[PDB]
Amino acid sequence: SLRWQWRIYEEPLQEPLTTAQGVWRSRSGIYLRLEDEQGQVGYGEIAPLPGWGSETLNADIALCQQLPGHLTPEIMATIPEALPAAQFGFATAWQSVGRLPYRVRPWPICALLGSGQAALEQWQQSWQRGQTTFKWKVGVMSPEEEQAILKALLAALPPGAKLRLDANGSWDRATANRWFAWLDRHGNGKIEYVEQPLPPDQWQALLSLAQTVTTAIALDESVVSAAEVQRWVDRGWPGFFVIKTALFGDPDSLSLLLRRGLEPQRLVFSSALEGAIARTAIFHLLETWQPCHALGFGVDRWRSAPLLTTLTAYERLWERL
Ligand code: NA
């Protein structure tokens, strides 16, 4: 066994984040610190994202208060499947004990483009800093206005650019269908996928669209936990899955899915606006999974979380609390 402690954090965003569901001003979570008898230390982070699945930080806190003062693999196996961010935090903390700091690498990162005409002026600085895959928010203006911008954006992007269109579940079914018909006529080798064209409740239409239209579709809001990923694999989802590792469960569950029916080439790993402990843990896991698409970690505007390169850096973060 080994000893451990946990601390809540509540960190203001670097700037506010507006979504269709309201303005975000801070992120909260839990940091875990594990120490063995000798003095080796490991760290993990539990940060469920409000609105994304059923797990709440309050439920993770209750879990932390219910666990024994000494952890073992069998104790950690008692963590409910309904708390996948807690599963991620404890599993990554355990695996880090006496293994920090981790070897990590730059992976390509997807650059964001803001809704509307902004996209046409925001790709250049990112391109000039070596980002070649972009994600642009759609479903904000009328379809016809966005299609006109899209036509100009595709003409302007340099050779080799890739573009993701993120609807965030904001289209109704007839609108999605009209968009996919437009993309069949006017789309381009630069379009990688449409992300979450319909809200998660419209799963039958999402599946039918993916099975019939010519442009790839990615699930995002639909796939938070390992259980949701498995449900979509078993439905025969032919598109992409955007995996938020910090929210998903024990990382070993993704590897198990991959050994089974999930295709590595259909994964895109993205950020849940987590902190440096979780992000560094995810980059360590990427040394095994070896991603083949630009990561959805271009989120520094809202939450900057530089990877941790020294054990003292973890200790500073912890003591700062
Ligand atoms: Na999305």
Structural notes for this entry:
By secondary structure, the chain is α/β, with parallel strands linked by helices. It folds into two domains: 1-104 and 308-321, Enolase-like, domain 1 (2-Layer Sandwich); 105-307, TIM Barrel (Alpha-Beta Barrel). It is built from twelve helices and eleven strands. The chain has helices at residues 57-66, 73-76, 84-96, 119-128, 143-156, 173-186, 203-212, 226-234, 245-248, 251-259, 276-289, 311-319, and strands at residues 2-19, 22-35, 41-46, 70-71, 111-113, 133-137, 162-166, 191-195, 217-219, 240-243, 267-269. It has a seven-stranded parallel sheet with strand order 5-6-7-8-9-10-11. It has a four-stranded antiparallel sheet with strand order 3-2-1-4, with helices on both faces. Strand 6, helix 5 (143-156) and strand 7 (162-166) form a beta-alpha-beta unit. The structure holds sodium ion. Sodium ion is lined by residues 166, 168, 195-196, 220-221. The PDB classes it as lyase. Keywords: structural genomics, O-succinylbenzoate synthase, PSI, protein structure initiative, new york structural genomics research consortium, nysgrc, New York SGX Research Center for Structural Genomics, nysgxrc, lyase. The assembly is monomeric.
